[PDB]
Task: structure prediction
Amino acid sequence: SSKLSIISWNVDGLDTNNLSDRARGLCSYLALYTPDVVFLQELIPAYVQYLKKRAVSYLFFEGSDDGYFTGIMLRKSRVKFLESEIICFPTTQMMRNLLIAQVTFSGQKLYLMTSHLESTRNQSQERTKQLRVVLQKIKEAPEDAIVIFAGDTNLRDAEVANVGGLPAGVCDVWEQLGKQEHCRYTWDTQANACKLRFDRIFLRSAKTAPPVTPDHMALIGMEKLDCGRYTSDHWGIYCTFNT
Ligand SMILES: [Mg+2]
Result:
Protein backbone atom coordinates (compact mmCIF):
# COMPACT_ATOMS: atom_id res chain seq x y z
CA SER A 1 0.00 0.00 0.00
CA SER A 2 1.32 3.41 -0.99
CA LYS A 3 -0.26 4.73 2.22
CA LEU A 4 2.09 5.77 5.02
CA SER A 5 0.98 4.68 8.50
CA ILE A 6 2.12 6.14 11.82
CA ILE A 7 1.50 5.75 15.53
CA SER A 8 2.17 8.52 18.07
CA TRP A 9 1.98 7.83 21.79
CA ASN A 10 3.10 9.25 25.13
CA VAL A 11 3.95 6.02 26.95
CA ASP A 12 3.84 7.57 30.45
CA GLY A 13 7.28 6.30 31.43
CA LEU A 14 7.28 8.56 34.48
CA ASP A 15 4.65 6.25 36.03
CA THR A 16 6.60 3.21 37.20
CA ASN A 17 3.52 1.25 38.34
CA ASN A 18 3.30 -1.96 36.26
CA LEU A 19 5.67 -0.41 33.71
CA SER A 20 6.86 -3.80 32.43
CA ASP A 21 3.30 -5.05 31.85
CA ARG A 22 2.41 -1.76 30.15
CA ALA A 23 5.52 -1.89 27.94
CA ARG A 24 4.46 -5.40 26.92
CA GLY A 25 1.05 -3.92 26.11
CA LEU A 26 2.57 -1.16 23.99
CA CYS A 27 4.68 -3.67 22.07
CA SER A 28 1.59 -5.77 21.31
CA TYR A 29 -0.16 -2.72 19.84
CA LEU A 30 2.90 -1.84 17.74
CA ALA A 31 3.05 -5.41 16.43
CA LEU A 32 -0.67 -5.53 15.60
CA TYR A 33 -0.53 -2.40 13.44
CA THR A 34 3.13 -2.64 12.29
CA PRO A 35 3.20 1.09 11.46
CA ASP A 36 5.75 2.60 9.12
CA VAL A 37 6.72 5.21 11.75
CA VAL A 38 6.31 5.34 15.53
CA PHE A 39 6.57 8.63 17.43
CA LEU A 40 7.02 8.07 21.16
CA GLN A 41 7.19 10.43 24.12
CA GLU A 42 8.17 10.03 27.79
CA LEU A 43 10.37 7.00 27.26
CA ILE A 44 12.93 6.07 29.92
CA PRO A 45 16.05 3.96 29.29
CA ALA A 46 14.59 0.69 30.62
CA TYR A 47 11.54 1.23 28.40
CA VAL A 48 13.41 1.81 25.14
CA GLN A 49 15.76 -1.07 25.96
CA TYR A 50 12.73 -3.35 26.22
CA LEU A 51 11.29 -2.12 22.91
CA LYS A 52 14.61 -2.57 21.10
CA LYS A 53 14.86 -6.21 22.20
CA ARG A 54 11.44 -6.94 20.69
CA ALA A 55 11.20 -4.62 17.66
CA VAL A 56 14.33 -5.53 15.70
CA SER A 57 12.58 -4.74 12.41
CA TYR A 58 12.70 -1.04 13.34
CA LEU A 59 15.46 1.56 13.48
CA PHE A 60 15.43 3.54 16.74
CA PHE A 61 16.30 7.17 17.45
CA GLU A 62 16.07 8.78 20.89
CA GLY A 63 15.90 12.36 22.10
CA SER A 64 18.27 11.64 24.98
CA ASP A 65 20.06 8.86 26.88
CA ASP A 66 19.16 10.16 30.36
CA GLY A 67 16.01 11.07 32.27
CA TYR A 68 12.93 10.77 30.05
CA PHE A 69 12.76 11.52 26.36
CA THR A 70 11.17 11.00 22.97
CA GLY A 71 11.86 8.43 20.28
CA ILE A 72 11.24 7.67 16.63
CA MET A 73 10.98 4.15 15.21
CA LEU A 74 11.27 3.50 11.47
CA ARG A 75 10.04 0.32 9.80
CA LYS A 76 13.14 -0.78 7.91
CA SER A 77 11.32 -2.67 5.14
CA ARG A 78 9.35 0.48 4.26
CA VAL A 79 11.44 3.57 5.10
CA LYS A 80 15.01 4.38 4.05
CA PHE A 81 16.97 6.39 6.58
CA LEU A 82 18.97 9.44 5.54
CA GLU A 83 19.93 11.36 8.69
CA SER A 84 18.72 12.57 12.07
CA GLU A 85 19.22 15.49 14.42
CA ILE A 86 18.06 17.02 17.68
CA ILE A 87 17.07 20.69 17.92
CA CYS A 88 17.41 22.08 21.44
CA PHE A 89 14.71 24.07 23.27
CA PRO A 90 17.03 26.54 25.05
CA THR A 91 14.59 27.52 27.83
CA THR A 92 12.92 24.18 28.58
CA GLN A 93 12.70 23.28 32.26
CA MET A 94 11.94 19.62 31.49
CA MET A 95 14.64 18.53 29.01
CA ARG A 96 12.25 18.86 26.06
CA ASN A 97 13.55 19.12 22.50
CA LEU A 98 12.76 18.40 18.86
CA LEU A 99 13.80 15.04 17.39
CA ILE A 100 13.95 14.84 13.60
CA ALA A 101 14.54 11.98 11.16
CA GLN A 102 14.94 12.50 7.40
CA VAL A 103 13.94 9.46 5.32
CA THR A 104 12.73 8.45 1.88
CA PHE A 105 9.43 6.60 1.42
CA SER A 106 9.06 5.18 -2.11
CA GLY A 107 11.35 7.87 -3.49
CA GLN A 108 9.63 10.69 -1.59
CA LYS A 109 11.58 12.57 1.07
CA LEU A 110 9.93 12.82 4.48
CA TYR A 111 10.98 14.92 7.46
CA LEU A 112 9.65 13.20 10.59
CA MET A 113 9.50 15.18 13.83
CA THR A 114 8.40 14.60 17.41
CA SER A 115 8.45 16.55 20.64
CA HIS A 116 6.96 16.38 24.14
CA LEU A 117 6.14 20.06 24.64
CA GLU A 118 6.57 21.56 28.11
CA SER A 119 4.11 20.15 30.63
CA THR A 120 1.78 21.71 33.22
CA ARG A 121 -0.72 24.56 32.88
CA ASN A 122 1.58 27.29 34.22
CA GLN A 123 4.33 26.59 31.67
CA SER A 124 1.98 27.90 28.97
CA GLN A 125 4.52 30.58 28.00
CA GLU A 126 7.41 28.15 27.47
CA ARG A 127 5.18 25.61 25.71
CA THR A 128 4.08 28.39 23.35
CA LYS A 129 7.69 29.32 22.61
CA GLN A 130 8.44 25.68 21.84
CA LEU A 131 5.42 25.40 19.54
CA ARG A 132 6.74 28.40 17.60
CA VAL A 133 10.09 26.64 17.16
CA VAL A 134 8.32 23.50 15.91
CA LEU A 135 6.13 25.40 13.44
CA GLN A 136 9.13 27.36 12.14
CA LYS A 137 11.06 24.13 11.57
CA ILE A 138 8.05 22.64 9.75
CA LYS A 139 7.77 25.73 7.54
CA GLU A 140 11.54 25.87 6.92
CA ALA A 141 11.94 22.22 5.97
CA PRO A 142 13.32 21.63 2.45
CA GLU A 143 10.49 21.99 -0.03
CA ASP A 144 11.08 18.60 -1.69
CA ALA A 145 9.95 16.93 1.56
CA ILE A 146 6.70 16.01 3.22
CA VAL A 147 6.80 17.05 6.88
CA ILE A 148 4.99 15.07 9.58
CA PHE A 149 5.15 16.25 13.18
CA ALA A 150 3.46 14.05 15.80
CA GLY A 151 3.78 14.40 19.53
CA ASP A 152 2.37 15.22 22.94
CA THR A 153 1.89 18.97 22.64
CA ASN A 154 0.25 19.52 26.06
CA LEU A 155 -1.70 22.29 24.30
CA ARG A 156 -4.88 23.78 25.72
CA ASP A 157 -7.14 26.86 25.76
CA ALA A 158 -5.98 29.26 22.98
CA GLU A 159 -2.23 28.59 23.08
CA VAL A 160 -2.18 27.80 19.35
CA ALA A 161 -4.00 31.07 18.75
CA ASN A 162 -1.36 32.87 20.81
CA VAL A 163 1.41 31.81 18.41
CA GLY A 164 -0.55 32.98 15.38
CA GLY A 165 -2.13 29.66 14.41
CA LEU A 166 -0.58 27.28 11.94
CA PRO A 167 1.65 28.53 9.12
CA ALA A 168 0.57 28.48 5.50
CA GLY A 169 0.43 24.95 4.11
CA VAL A 170 0.48 23.29 7.55
CA CYS A 171 -2.61 21.49 8.82
CA ASP A 172 -3.70 19.73 11.98
CA VAL A 173 -4.61 16.22 10.83
CA TRP A 174 -7.51 15.84 13.28
CA GLU A 175 -8.97 19.14 12.06
CA GLN A 176 -8.33 18.25 8.42
CA LEU A 177 -10.24 14.97 8.77
CA GLY A 178 -13.30 16.86 10.03
CA LYS A 179 -12.83 17.28 13.80
CA GLN A 180 -14.45 13.91 14.36
CA GLU A 181 -15.61 13.53 17.95
CA HIS A 182 -14.76 9.84 18.32
CA CYS A 183 -11.00 10.45 18.09
CA ARG A 184 -10.82 13.93 19.61
CA TYR A 185 -9.61 13.66 23.22
CA THR A 186 -6.29 11.88 23.79
CA TRP A 187 -6.02 12.53 27.56
CA ASP A 188 -9.14 11.75 29.59
CA THR A 189 -9.15 11.53 33.40
CA GLN A 190 -12.70 10.09 33.33
CA ALA A 191 -12.23 7.22 30.87
CA ASN A 192 -8.58 6.52 31.77
CA ALA A 193 -14.04 15.42 34.32
CA CYS A 194 -11.07 16.60 32.24
CA LYS A 195 -10.60 15.73 28.56
CA LEU A 196 -7.93 17.39 26.41
CA ARG A 197 -6.47 17.03 22.91
CA PHE A 198 -2.80 16.97 23.89
CA ASP A 199 -1.60 14.63 21.15
CA ARG A 200 -1.60 16.20 17.69
CA ILE A 201 -0.23 15.61 14.19
CA PHE A 202 0.87 18.49 11.96
CA LEU A 203 1.34 17.96 8.24
CA ARG A 204 2.97 19.90 5.40
CA SER A 205 3.18 18.76 1.80
CA ALA A 206 6.19 18.86 -0.50
CA LYS A 207 6.16 21.49 -3.23
CA THR A 208 7.37 18.77 -5.62
CA ALA A 209 4.49 16.29 -5.19
CA PRO A 210 0.69 16.52 -5.15
CA PRO A 211 -0.72 17.56 -1.77
CA VAL A 212 -0.62 14.87 0.88
CA THR A 213 -3.98 14.28 2.47
CA PRO A 214 -4.66 12.41 5.72
CA ASP A 215 -6.69 9.28 5.10
CA HIS A 216 -7.79 7.89 8.46
CA MET A 217 -7.17 8.56 12.14
CA ALA A 218 -8.13 6.53 15.19
CA LEU A 219 -7.27 6.32 18.87
CA ILE A 220 -5.68 3.13 20.17
CA GLY A 221 -4.77 1.61 23.52
CA MET A 222 -8.28 1.89 24.95
CA GLU A 223 -8.32 -1.67 26.35
CA LYS A 224 -7.20 -2.33 29.91
CA LEU A 225 -4.31 -4.77 30.21
CA ASP A 226 -4.28 -7.96 32.27
CA CYS A 227 -2.82 -5.92 35.16
CA GLY A 228 -5.97 -3.78 35.32
CA ARG A 229 -4.33 -0.61 34.01
CA TYR A 230 -4.15 1.00 30.60
CA THR A 231 -0.91 1.07 28.63
CA SER A 232 -0.70 4.82 29.25
CA ASP A 233 -2.62 7.73 30.72
CA HIS A 234 -2.75 8.90 27.09
CA TRP A 235 -4.51 7.22 24.22
CA GLY A 236 -2.31 6.60 21.22
CA ILE A 237 -3.00 7.89 17.72
CA TYR A 238 -2.96 5.73 14.59
CA CYS A 239 -3.00 7.67 11.33
CA THR A 240 -2.54 6.98 7.62
CA PHE A 241 -1.74 9.33 4.75
CA ASN A 242 -2.53 9.28 1.03
CA THR A 243 1.04 9.46 -0.27
MG1 LIG B 1 3.34 10.80 32.48
Remarks:
- Residues 12, 14-15, 42, 233 surround magnesium ion (CB under 6 Å).
- The chain is about 20% helix and 35% strand.
- Residues 1-243 form a domain with the Deoxyribonuclease I; Chain A fold (CATH 3.60.10.10).
